[PDB]
Amino acid sequence: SYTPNLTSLTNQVNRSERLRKWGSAGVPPGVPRIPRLEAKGIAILHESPKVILAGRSRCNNFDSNQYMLINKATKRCLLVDASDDWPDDWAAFIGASDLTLTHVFLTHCHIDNIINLNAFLTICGSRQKQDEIGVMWCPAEECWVQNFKRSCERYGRFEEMHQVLPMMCRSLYTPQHLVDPVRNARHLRRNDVLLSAATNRATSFIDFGNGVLLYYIFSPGHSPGHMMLHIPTERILFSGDLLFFNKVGRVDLPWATGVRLAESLRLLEALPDNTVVVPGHGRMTTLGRERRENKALQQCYQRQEIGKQEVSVGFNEGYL
Amino acid sequence: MFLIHFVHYKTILQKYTFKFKHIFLSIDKYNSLFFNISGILIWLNIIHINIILIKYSFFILINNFEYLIILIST
Ligand SMILES: [Zn+2]
Ligand SMILES: [Zn+2]
Numbered sequence: 001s002y003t004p005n006l007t008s009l010t011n012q013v014n015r016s017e018r019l020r021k022w023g024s025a026g027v028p029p030g031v032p033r034i035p036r037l038e039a040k041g042i043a044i045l046h047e048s049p050k051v052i053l054a055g056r057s058r059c060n061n062f063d064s065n066q067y068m069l070i071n072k073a074t075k076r077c078l079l080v081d082a083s084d085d086w087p088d089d090w091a092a093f094i095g096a097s098d099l100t101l102t103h104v105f106l107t108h109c110h111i112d113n114i115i116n117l118n119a120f121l122t123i124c125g126s127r128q129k130q131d132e133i134g135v136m137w138c139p140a141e142e143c144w145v146q147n148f149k150r151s152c153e154r155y156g157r158f159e160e161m162h163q164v165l166p167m168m169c170r171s172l173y174t175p176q177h178l179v180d181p182v183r184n185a186r187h188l189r190r191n192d193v194l195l196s197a198a199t200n201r202a203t204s205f206i207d208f209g210n211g212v213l214l215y216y217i218f219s220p221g222h223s224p225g226h227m228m229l230h231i232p233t234e235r236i237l238f239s240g241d242l243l244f245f246n247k248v249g250r251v252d253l254p255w256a257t258g259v260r261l262a263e264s265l266r267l268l269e270a271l272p273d274n275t276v277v278v279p280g281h282g283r284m285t286t287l288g289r290e291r292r293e294n295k296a297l298q299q300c301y302q303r304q305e306i307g308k309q310e311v312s313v314g315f316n317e318g319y320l
Numbered sequence: 321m322f323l324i325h326f327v328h329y330k331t332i333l334q335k336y337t338f339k340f341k342h343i344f345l346s347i348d349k350y351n352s353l354f355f356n357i358s359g360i361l362i363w364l365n366i367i368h369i370n371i372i373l374i375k376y377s378f379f380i381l382i383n384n385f386e387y388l389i390i391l392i393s394t
Contacts, residue, residue, distance in 0.1 A: 139353060139381065139383060140383055140384075140385035142352070142353050143385070145351075146351045146352070168351065168353075172394075173353075173355055173356065173381075173394035174353070174354055174355060174356060175354060175355075175356055194381055194394065196380060196381050196382045197382045197383060197384045197385075198380070198382040218384070220384070220385075224385035224386075225383075225385060255385075
């Protein structure tokens with residue numbers, strides 16, 4: 001959780017809470033790795049003349065999902081929110097599909113999204129050995145990168161603790177190392193892009209190839225930097241943690257504001273209803289069904305209509 | 321009454337104690353992003369700071385996490 005200082009140790013309410021939550025143990029059980037039993041295979045969710053969406057549901061005990069976009073022309077694949085307890089099915093799928101992994105998109109840097117990121121990059125680069133995989137992320141998530149170890153402390157992920165994150169290594173946006181004159185696997189990662197919060201419909205896109213454009217949208221509230229993917233030609237909205245089936249993201253975590261989440265839900269009203277929204281957790285829905293049957297959006301627009309200047313919406317129990 | 325004037329033969333020396341800052345050590349070990357910057361524009365509603373180093377072409381990164389932060393050429 002947090003650092004045990006003098007005030008937290010001399011508090012009886014802390015021991016009372018640790019007795020009430022966890023019984024006689026007092027220590028929270030972590031979020032473990034999914035074993036090789038009760039693990040499902042990779043499903044091909046969508047097939048189109050342009051792209052192919054292949055995904056796997058409940059790949060963590062955080063109950064997150066793992067998706068990959070495949071360009072049919074250029075044979076280039078793109079993982080979004082790379083968090084799978086077994087990134088060996090995905091590397092075998094890429095190698096048996098004759099695909100090239102060039103980038104990994106990250107919506108936000110919570111632990112349910114970047115827990116197995118070094119495993120993804122290492123196994124896919126090792127298969128590429130028989131240009132490295134880049135990472136696309138927003139720099140505000142820097143504040144959630146530094147607490148990757150602490151989040152690995154509380155959720156019992158001890159083997160992923162002592163791992164330098166690839167977003168922390170020196171990119172082209174950073175100063176370079178002045179090495180002794182007498183190496184480049186970790187010293188410089190030239191394939192790295194930093195997304196900007198000024199997202200527009202004109203130039204805020206990634207050229208995926210074959211005329212397919214992936215517009216990233218800056219939508220905070222669950223994170224200081226939270227980037228959705230929008231494919232208007234395929235009507236596909238990778239929302240990440242902003243919007244789910246009949247629910248929205250949490251605000252009861254640090255660096256999460258309810259009015260930022262309300263503005264992020266309000267910047268979504270110009271998309272058509274047949275846009276399939278694809279969340280980071282749970283089952284996928286459409287944006288029209290979320291306009292009709294989601295109570296968080298109903299409360300947001302009702303507070304906006306009755307005259308609330310600072311409309312604050314958000315969940316306190318749900319997905320991280 | 322008092323008969324003699326006597327002094328004590330044992331001479332004591334007052335120990336001079338003083339606290340000075342003689343050592344200068346600091347643990348400089350952080351986990352943060354450090355950037356090559358050709359321009360930085362910090363816009364919060366009270367104070368605006370514009371720091372510009374010139375170039376032929378620039379890029380733009382924008383951070384709205386705490387306050388508006390515009391970075392030219394990362
Ligand atoms: Zn999250
Ligand atoms: Zn999530």
